Ligand binder design. Structure first.
Ligand SMILES: Nc1ncnc2c1ncn2[C@H]1C[C@H](O)[C@@H](COP(=O)(O)OP(=O)(O)OP(=O)(O)O)O1
Ligand SMILES: Nc1ncnc2c1ncn2[C@H]1C[C@H](O)[C@@H](COP(=O)(O)OP(=O)(O)OP(=O)(O)O)O1
Ligand SMILES: [Mg+2]
Lengths: 197, 197
């Protein structure tokens, strides 16, 4: 098919308002936008959770076919999970003037003690665009997993790719960044092992 | 150092949840203490958490025709970081008190895209961004006859599975729910088509 129809020019962001400002923000967008039928929308307002944007790193060891995961508590998981301690990808906020790659390498070093070799982009996704602006940009990074060493109270895990992917299937890994990265790895590891060796 | 293939909820003390903002959505300050990997308990920690409820997601897959049904609508929170705020997405809706994932998914497929659903199977249930929001989304794949789709301003698209996945690879589909669902389909479609035929 022919994909989406409209672009930014087809929407008028009339104004924004910050309804809550703390560590994060809750903003109200007021806007009008074009309709598929032709006309123009009424004035629309939407609450948006604003927390900046993140870089994510999947540490992959192509010699060993192993991944490095970081475990730490995420209290927001409490209400819908058996435990709020989650197995996750390395990640951090992108500050002004920083690149996805700069941040991913830095966080790999200070959350997992990992020196990263080559990187490659995986995917950049919107976490939940009905209610938050957050975008997370994922890279895969070449590591030697035998060197992983842990520490914000963080435990470092080394597991085989196949076990990590089985834990996605089983629900033991169930946060978006880690699901997306590990599904991508399951689709791309043959070529990635070919390339990095 | 690391762990090579822990805590439960008795190891966390939620002291308070302090309302920060109440509107359409909510922002709460969680105040809590938790067990530390090296022994003892943390001091009191506070985290701002976006509370917006939880969602059911349906990937409508026609296994006879190897086609997927996508829905297009504007999501203004995509504006700042995306080429366009109109997104191609899976069918989805909030789960209200007492409702099941399957009931919500089937209802939204009918109202959002005109589809009756035959068999379903679970894909995965994931936390969208658990550092800052409690939101969980539970994805099903639903058997549909893609030649019955039709159709808040929404436009329905019927595309080959291979095209929908190519759009994930190219960044033209880049919201978490649709990426996770279509990566899962690319890993499972051969067995799924055989099971449903
Ligand atoms: N991120 C969001 N996604 C979806 N709905 C949202 C979001 N933030 C706020 N809302 C709700 C709050 C309001 O009920 C509704 C606003 O819709 P809109 O078309 O702008 O005005 P309205 O006059 O229909 O609304 P109201 O129901 O408050 O009278 O959207
Ligand atoms: N959801 C969140 N994720 C990550 N950091 C968060 C989140 N919400 C708030 N923060 C940040 C903001 C503050 O730096 C800190 C929250 O307050 P808190 O844990 O009490 O530390 P603090 O810097 O205010 O010091 P003190 O312990 O002396 O009160 O964490
Ligand atoms: Mg960090």
């Amino acid at each position: 098919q022919q994909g989406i129809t409209f672009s930014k020019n087809d929407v008028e962001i009339i104004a924004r308002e910050t309804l809550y400002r703390g560590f994060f923000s809750l903003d109200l967008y007021r806007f009008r936008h074009r309709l598929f039928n032709g006309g123009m929308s009424g004035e629309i307002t939407r609450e948006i959770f604003e927390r900046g944007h993140a870089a994510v790193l999947l540490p992959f060891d192509p010699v060993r076919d192993e991944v490095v995961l970081v475990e730490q508590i995420r209290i927001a998981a409490y209400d819908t999970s058996e435990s709020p301690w989650l197995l996750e990808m390395v990640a951090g906020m992108i500050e002004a003037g920083e690149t996805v790659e700069d941040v991913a390498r830095r966080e790999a070093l200070e959350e997992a003690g990992l020196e990263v070799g080559r990187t490659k982009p995986i995917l950049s996704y919107l976490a939940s665009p009905g209610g938050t602006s957050e975008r997370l940009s994922i890279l895969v990074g070449e590591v030697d997993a035998s060197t992983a060493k842990g520490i914000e109270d963080i435990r470092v895990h080394v597991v085989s790719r196949e076990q990590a992917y089985q834990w996605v299937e089983e629900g033991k890994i169930d946060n978006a960044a880690s699901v997306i990265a590990l599904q991508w790895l399951q689709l791309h590891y043959h070529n990635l092992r070919n390339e990095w060796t």
